[PDB]
Amino acid sequence: IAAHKGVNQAPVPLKMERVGPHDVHIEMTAQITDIEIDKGKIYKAWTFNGQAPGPLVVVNEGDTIHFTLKNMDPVVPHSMNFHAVHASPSKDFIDVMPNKSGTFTYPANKPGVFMYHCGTKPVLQHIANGMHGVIIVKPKNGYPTDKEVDREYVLIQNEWYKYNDMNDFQNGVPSYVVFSSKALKPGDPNTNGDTFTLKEKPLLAKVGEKIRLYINNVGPNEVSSFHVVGTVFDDVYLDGNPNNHLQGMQTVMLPASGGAVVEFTVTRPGTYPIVTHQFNHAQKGAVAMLKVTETGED
Amino acid sequence: IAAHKGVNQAPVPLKMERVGPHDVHIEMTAQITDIEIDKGKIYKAWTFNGQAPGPLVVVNEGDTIHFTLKNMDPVVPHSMNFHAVHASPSKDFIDVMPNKSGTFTYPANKPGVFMYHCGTKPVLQHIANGMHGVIIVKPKNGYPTDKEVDREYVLIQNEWYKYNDMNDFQNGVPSYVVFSSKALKPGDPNTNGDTFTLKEKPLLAKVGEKIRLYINNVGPNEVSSFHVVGTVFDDVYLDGNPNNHLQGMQTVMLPASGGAVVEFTVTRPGTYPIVTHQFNHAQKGAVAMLKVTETGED
Amino acid sequence: IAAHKGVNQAPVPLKMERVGPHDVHIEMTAQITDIEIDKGKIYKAWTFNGQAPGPLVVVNEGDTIHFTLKNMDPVVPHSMNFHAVHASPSKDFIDVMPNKSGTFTYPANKPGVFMYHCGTKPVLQHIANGMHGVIIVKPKNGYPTDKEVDREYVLIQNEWYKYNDMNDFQNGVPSYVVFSSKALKPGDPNTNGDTFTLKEKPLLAKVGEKIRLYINNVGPNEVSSFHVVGTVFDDVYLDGNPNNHLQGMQTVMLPASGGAVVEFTVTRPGTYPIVTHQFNHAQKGAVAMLKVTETGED
Ligand SMILES: [Cl-]
Ligand SMILES: [Cl-]
Ligand SMILES: [Cl-]
Ligand SMILES: [Cu+2]
Ligand SMILES: [Cu+2]
Ligand SMILES: [Cu+2]
Ligand SMILES: [Cu+2]
Ligand SMILES: [Cu+2]
Ligand SMILES: [Cu+2]
Ligand SMILES: [Cu+2]
Ligand SMILES: [Cu+2]
Ligand SMILES: [Cu+2]
Ligand SMILES: [Cu+2]
Ligand SMILES: [Cu+2]
Ligand SMILES: [Cu+2]
Ligand SMILES: [Cu+2]
Ligand SMILES: [Cu+2]
Ligand SMILES: [Cu+2]
Ligand code: NA
Ligand code: NA
Ligand code: NA
Ligand code: NA
Ligand code: NA
Ligand code: NA
């Protein structure tokens, strides 16, 4: 795209603020930002806020979201589809033109771990170029295991293909499959989908802890066989809905866009890989690490 | 196949009639019929009754099916495998030769949304060329959410490959992935697996309704990440068995041959896409539309 | 690998013995063994004990496993990862060098049907070359349907690729997809992952029986759509955990490394195919047979 040559828009922080007991404002950008997806490999990603996947959004069950998208792309329209919400797609998930903003309002009625993404046609192109992310909707009544959880993180799986290549997007294997982590609390890591950061800077935990991961496989195209080496999931809530409660799973099958809340215990000090067990994808980048120490500090 | 050149057998209606409180007769054909699977692209499909996927069958839990296949193919044997039934495959799912009929009897003991397909070796070839469909077995005691449902439709996902090409069937990506709808009540659409009909003639609903979809991914080869844009599934019954009850799912993972009953609420007027969220497949055709109006009429 | 040329190490029996009410010893080898994966096609597999998948391990919930690996490979290190156990991967799943042994101890706290595999980097290479298997952990309180089961077997699904070809392992379709059975009781078959043995020598059962299969899809790369022709699964326990209880499923979606306990009734004499319903994989070998006779003998 001629108008994207040389464009590298600096990341912009997510803007969120609560405006009522059940109403929140969210503003994001659509912007074109260079991301190092593998060592020496830059992808000029189509992004929300200069991150791919985009910034984490967390709201409460029953919140109405007043969402603004500011399109900084000089030529391509962009939009927003939140899987969390009940909305009219043809009125509320519509395109925002270059250098314009649009505001859309809709409720998040359902607890869970939802994908969000750009919904501009061709949707495959917008997702594959980087316009994906997660919104967590916290259940009003919690999860039955909340009291047992010591530490929690968010992980997202995505693929990367040949740059802006619709033939490859439709017909080719992924070049990379990757994990990223998005921060829930101050001090948590906040990373983009790449083959290396969560290997070189593992997530941290303490011996004996029960860890919760909020996970989503945003695709665009693959399913995920999510597994933590050296443990078994004590409890799994499919899509993060507390009703969808499995126990003692080795591996959680996630569709494309599928989410889960998974919980597991780390019993011994060491480094614990986190994979998709589709090992072709793991080999192409989709391995993160959890470093478990006697203190929980590095 | 030399004997199929120029052959285009007109579709033949499904013949069904109840013959006892727990016994039904079903007659279908195997026939060779040209279907427009994408604009300008004719596939000389191997079919039941001149439809691909084939005609919808609906029976009640506990019905015994007395099934007749009339093979109109001039050269290829065909057969019938219903996933709904308990049967001896080597006695009851056997081949019917060209220009012959066979009758097979077996019970449908289990409620749900089942695949049916030709079972003639090589089964991949017969399924991929179009010999797939759905049989719904209605639960004797219903679903716990029956009273909440306002409107219901059937959707089926399938793939299409290069014509009768066993190398492609085994080793290649699908050329098209498609949805079709099969009629449950007079006035419902009844379509074949193509890339366009359910975009140009969306399914219809009314603002505020709870919609039930009976869905099955017949493959032959892919899994499906089934998602309705702008809503969340209130309730999901895996394989249509009332016991297998999930709530609040964004996306339902279907294996090849996998079924579900899914229910969701449409809260606002507009057009709602229905996808597999494996977006390579969506791009290759697997997007249907649901048009939601203030009246439920177009 | 030059040091593997001409190497064909004869299979070695699994060594297991109970050493306390909640402690068991297991010794396995890593060894290089020629396996006929399709007629006329030898794969010089990387194996545990000269089988691929490896030998079946069965323990009780709450057993601690004292595991020894004896590496007979002349040049490649190998290791062991049991999905059943809680362990430190970086201390307990570590490499054993050629011509050495290592012993590792860890508890199997969770009931189910778990994958095991070599964990040596690149893990994809070790799994794809044959270093995979199943460990069953029997639930202390059984399954609620135990009293109904008449006969049981273990089935494992795996893929085979071009020989030791990491490009193919990462980027190519499988050349073969296969089932094997591993013996639970004297007289049960014990086979390797090949395209033919369970067709030519079907598993045996008796008309009217309820059959339990302990199943796992070890991959390395594909998911599985597990289906028995001519029946419906009465009960399914995902990952073999008794809590994860589905009923009346036609087909069970298994992630890579995913397990299940599935139970079904065979109502009539005949031969019943067992497939992955991803029919490209079935065509490439993944069809086993269950022969149901009036006596249960051939
Ligand atoms: Cl692993
Ligand atoms: Cl979508
Ligand atoms: Cl089948
Ligand atoms: Cu309030
Ligand atoms: Cu506002
Ligand atoms: Cu966009
Ligand atoms: Cu979406
Ligand atoms: Cu704790
Ligand atoms: Cu009656
Ligand atoms: Cu009759
Ligand atoms: Cu046929
Ligand atoms: Cu089938
Ligand atoms: Cu209503
Ligand atoms: Cu004891
Ligand atoms: Cu010992
Ligand atoms: Cu190894
Ligand atoms: Cu593993
Ligand atoms: Cu019995
Ligand atoms: Na792929
Ligand atoms: Na792919
Ligand atoms: Na494919
Ligand atoms: Na495919
Ligand atoms: Na594949
Ligand atoms: Na593959």
Side-chain angles (χ1 to χ4, degrees):
Chain A
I1 293 173
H4 289 179
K5 291 167 68 77
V7 174
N8 182 18
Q9 297 173 314
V12 170
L14 176 68
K15 295 191 217 143
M16 283 190 69
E17 64 189 348
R18 180 163 296 281
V19 298
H22 306 288
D23 286 274
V24 297
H25 278 202
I26 303 180
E27 175 176 278
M28 296 168 49
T29 67
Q31 62 181 83
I32 304 304
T33 301
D34 283 349
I35 295 176
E36 185 171 35
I37 61 169
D38 184 33
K39 299 221 166 176
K41 181 72 162 182
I42 294 292
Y43 198 104
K44 184 180 299 301
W46 302 6
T47 75
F48 296 105
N49 287 79
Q51 289 178 49
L56 186 63
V57 175
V58 179
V59 301
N60 293 332
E61 175 178 5
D63 280 340
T64 289
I65 297 168
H66 314 193
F67 173 75
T68 299
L69 184 63
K70 177 185 299 177
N71 188 0
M72 303 165 53
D73 189 317
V75 291
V76 189
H78 297 291
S79 59
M80 178 60 85
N81 174 332
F82 289 106
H83 284 197
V85 305
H86 283 83
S88 165
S90 54
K91 298 174 172 203
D92 300 323
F93 297 169
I94 59 168
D95 292 341
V96 178
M97 302 298 294
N99 301 310
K100 304 301 181 176
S101 292
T103 300
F104 311 99
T105 300
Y106 25 55
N109 296 308
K110 301 286 195 188
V113 184
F114 294 98
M115 180 172 179
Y116 72 71
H117 58 88
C118 180
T120 299
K121 160 156 199 16
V123 174
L124 171 62
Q125 184 175 19
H126 289 255
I127 298 177
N129 281 325
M131 306 196 74
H132 41 68
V134 166
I135 176 170
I136 295 171
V137 182
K138 297 184 75 274
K140 169 67 181 311
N141 299 306
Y143 297 90
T145 49
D146 279 349
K147 100 220 133 196
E148 302 166 13
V149 173
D150 298 305
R151 189 176 306 283
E152 62 185 13
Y153 297 109
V154 177
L155 288 178
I156 306 174
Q157 184 178 315
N158 75 267
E159 308 124 39
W160 295 107
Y161 293 84
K162 303 172 183 180
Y163 187 73
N164 196 40
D165 178 345
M166 273 290 277
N167 180 59
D168 196 54
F169 294 172
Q170 286 174 81
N171 296 311
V173 297
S175 289
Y176 312 94
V177 187
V178 297
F179 288 114
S180 61
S181 191
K182 301 297 182 179
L184 284 162
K185 70 186 182 285
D188 284 345
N190 198 77
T191 71
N192 294 309
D194 72 39
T195 63
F196 55 89
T197 293
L198 295 171
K199 294 175 175 65
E200 290 173 1
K201 300 171 146 190
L203 300 177
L204 304 172
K206 180 171 164 175
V207 173
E209 283 183 334
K210 174 169 304 226
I211 311 300
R212 173 179 291 171
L213 302 174
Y214 301 84
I215 67 180
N216 192 288
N217 167 33
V218 300
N221 298 330
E222 306 290 344
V223 303
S224 175
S225 294
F226 186 82
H227 176 74
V228 179
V229 179
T231 191
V232 182
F233 299 117
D234 302 315
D235 296 275
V236 173
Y237 306 95
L238 299 179
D239 273 340
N241 186 289
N243 290 290
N244 302 331
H245 191 172
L246 300 171
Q247 297 183 60
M249 300 290 295
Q250 73 195 296
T251 296
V252 177
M253 179 83 279
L254 300 171
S257 76
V261 169
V262 303
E263 297 170 0
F264 56 91
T265 304
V266 289
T267 63
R268 292 176 179 178
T271 298
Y272 292 64
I274 300 169
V275 308
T276 176
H277 220 284
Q278 292 156 237
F279 254 91
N280 53 354
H281 299 166
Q283 178 62 28
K284 291 190 286 185
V287 179
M289 301 290 185
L290 175 65
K291 187 167 171 172
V292 180
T293 64
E294 294 293 345
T295 62
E297 308 269 11
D298 217 320
Chain B
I1 293 173
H4 289 179
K5 291 167 68 77
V7 174
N8 182 18
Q9 297 173 314
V12 170
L14 176 68
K15 295 191 217 143
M16 283 190 69
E17 64 189 348
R18 180 163 296 281
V19 298
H22 306 288
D23 286 274
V24 297
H25 278 202
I26 303 180
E27 175 176 278
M28 296 168 49
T29 67
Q31 62 181 83
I32 304 304
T33 301
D34 283 349
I35 295 176
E36 185 171 35
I37 61 169
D38 184 33
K39 299 221 166 176
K41 181 72 162 182
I42 294 292
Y43 198 104
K44 184 180 299 301
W46 302 6
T47 75
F48 296 105
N49 287 79
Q51 289 178 49
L56 186 63
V57 175
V58 179
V59 301
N60 293 332
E61 175 178 5
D63 280 340
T64 289
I65 297 168
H66 314 193
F67 173 75
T68 299
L69 184 63
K70 177 185 299 177
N71 188 0
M72 303 165 53
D73 189 317
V75 291
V76 189
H78 297 291
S79 59
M80 178 60 85
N81 174 332
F82 289 106
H83 284 197
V85 305
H86 283 84
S88 165
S90 54
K91 298 174 172 203
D92 300 323
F93 297 169
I94 59 168
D95 292 341
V96 178
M97 302 298 294
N99 301 310
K100 304 301 181 176
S101 292
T103 300
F104 311 99
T105 300
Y106 25 55
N109 296 308
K110 301 286 195 188
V113 184
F114 294 98
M115 180 172 179
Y116 72 71
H117 58 88
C118 180
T120 299
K121 160 156 199 16
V123 174
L124 171 62
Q125 184 175 19
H126 289 255
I127 298 177
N129 281 325
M131 306 196 74
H132 41 68
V134 166
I135 176 170
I136 295 171
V137 182
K138 297 184 75 274
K140 169 67 181 311
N141 299 306
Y143 297 90
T145 49
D146 279 349
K147 100 220 133 196
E148 302 166 13
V149 173
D150 298 305
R151 189 176 306 283
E152 62 185 13
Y153 297 109
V154 177
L155 288 178
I156 306 174
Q157 184 178 315
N158 75 267
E159 308 124 39
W160 295 107
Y161 293 84
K162 303 172 183 180
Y163 187 73
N164 196 40
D165 178 345
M166 273 290 277
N167 180 59
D168 196 54
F169 294 172
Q170 286 174 81
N171 296 311
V173 297
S175 289
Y176 312 94
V177 187
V178 297
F179 288 114
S180 61
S181 191
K182 301 297 182 179
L184 284 162
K185 70 186 182 285
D188 284 345
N190 198 77
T191 71
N192 294 309
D194 72 39
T195 63
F196 55 89
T197 293
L198 295 171
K199 294 175 175 65
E200 290 173 1
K201 300 171 146 190
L203 300 177
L204 304 172
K206 180 171 164 175
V207 173
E209 283 183 334
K210 174 169 304 226
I211 311 300
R212 173 179 291 171
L213 302 174
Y214 301 84
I215 67 180
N216 192 288
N217 167 33
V218 299
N221 298 330
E222 306 290 344
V223 303
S224 175
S225 294
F226 186 82
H227 176 74
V228 179
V229 179
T231 191
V232 182
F233 299 117
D234 302 315
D235 296 275
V236 173
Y237 306 95
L238 299 179
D239 273 340
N241 186 289
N243 290 290
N244 302 331
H245 191 172
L246 300 171
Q247 297 183 60
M249 300 290 295
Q250 73 195 296
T251 296
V252 177
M253 179 83 279
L254 300 171
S257 76
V261 169
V262 303
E263 297 170 0
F264 56 91
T265 304
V266 289
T267 63
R268 292 176 179 178
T271 298
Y272 292 64
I274 300 169
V275 308
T276 176
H277 220 284
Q278 291 156 237
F279 254 91
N280 53 354
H281 299 166
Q283 178 62 28
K284 291 190 286 185
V287 179
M289 301 290 185
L290 175 65
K291 187 167 171 172
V292 180
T293 64
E294 294 293 345
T295 62
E297 308 269 11
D298 217 320
Chain C
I1 293 173
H4 289 179
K5 291 167 68 77
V7 174
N8 182 18
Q9 297 173 314
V12 170
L14 176 68
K15 295 191 217 143
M16 283 190 69
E17 64 189 348
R18 180 163 296 281
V19 298
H22 306 288
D23 286 274
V24 297
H25 278 202
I26 303 180
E27 175 176 278
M28 296 168 49
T29 67
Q31 62 181 83
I32 304 304
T33 301
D34 283 349
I35 295 176
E36 185 171 35
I37 61 169
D38 184 33
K39 299 221 166 176
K41 181 72 162 182
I42 294 292
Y43 198 104
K44 184 180 299 301
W46 302 6
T47 75
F48 296 105
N49 287 79
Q51 289 178 49
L56 186 63
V57 175
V58 179
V59 301
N60 293 332
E61 175 178 5
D63 280 340
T64 289
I65 297 168
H66 314 193
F67 173 75
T68 299
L69 184 63
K70 177 185 299 177
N71 188 0
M72 303 165 53
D73 189 317
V75 291
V76 189
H78 297 291
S79 59
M80 178 60 85
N81 174 332
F82 289 106
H83 284 197
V85 305
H86 283 83
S88 165
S90 54
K91 298 174 172 203
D92 300 323
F93 297 169
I94 59 168
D95 292 341
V96 178
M97 302 298 294
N99 301 310
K100 304 301 181 176
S101 292
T103 300
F104 311 99
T105 300
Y106 25 55
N109 296 308
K110 301 286 195 188
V113 184
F114 294 98
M115 180 172 179
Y116 72 71
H117 58 88
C118 180
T120 299
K121 160 156 199 16
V123 174
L124 171 62
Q125 184 175 19
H126 289 255
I127 298 177
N129 281 325
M131 306 196 74
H132 41 68
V134 166
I135 176 170
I136 295 171
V137 182
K138 297 184 75 274
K140 169 67 181 311
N141 299 306
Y143 297 90
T145 49
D146 279 349
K147 100 220 133 196
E148 302 166 13
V149 173
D150 298 305
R151 189 176 306 283
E152 62 185 13
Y153 297 109
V154 177
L155 288 178
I156 306 174
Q157 184 178 315
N158 75 267
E159 308 124 39
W160 295 107
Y161 293 84
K162 303 172 183 180
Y163 187 73
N164 196 40
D165 178 345
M166 273 290 277
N167 180 59
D168 196 54
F169 294 172
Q170 286 174 81
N171 296 311
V173 297
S175 289
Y176 312 94
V177 187
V178 297
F179 288 114
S180 61
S181 191
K182 301 297 182 179
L184 284 162
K185 70 186 182 285
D188 284 345
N190 198 77
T191 71
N192 294 309
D194 72 39
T195 63
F196 55 89
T197 293
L198 295 171
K199 294 175 175 65
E200 290 173 1
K201 300 171 146 190
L203 300 177
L204 304 172
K206 180 171 164 175
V207 173
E209 283 183 334
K210 174 169 304 226
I211 311 300
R212 173 179 291 171
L213 302 174
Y214 301 84
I215 67 180
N216 192 288
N217 167 33
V218 300
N221 298 330
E222 306 290 344
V223 303
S224 175
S225 294
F226 186 82
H227 176 74
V228 179
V229 179
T231 191
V232 182
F233 299 117
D234 302 315
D235 296 275
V236 173
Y237 306 95
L238 299 179
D239 273 340
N241 186 289
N243 290 290
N244 302 331
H245 191 172
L246 300 171
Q247 297 183 60
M249 300 290 295
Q250 73 195 296
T251 296
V252 177
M253 179 83 279
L254 300 171
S257 76
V261 169
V262 303
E263 297 170 0
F264 56 91
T265 304
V266 289
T267 63
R268 292 176 179 178
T271 298
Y272 292 64
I274 300 169
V275 308
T276 176
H277 220 284
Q278 292 156 237
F279 254 91
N280 53 354
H281 299 166
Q283 178 62 28
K284 291 190 286 185
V287 179
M289 301 290 185
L290 175 65
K291 187 167 171 172
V292 180
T293 64
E294 294 293 345
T295 62
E297 308 269 11
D298 217 320

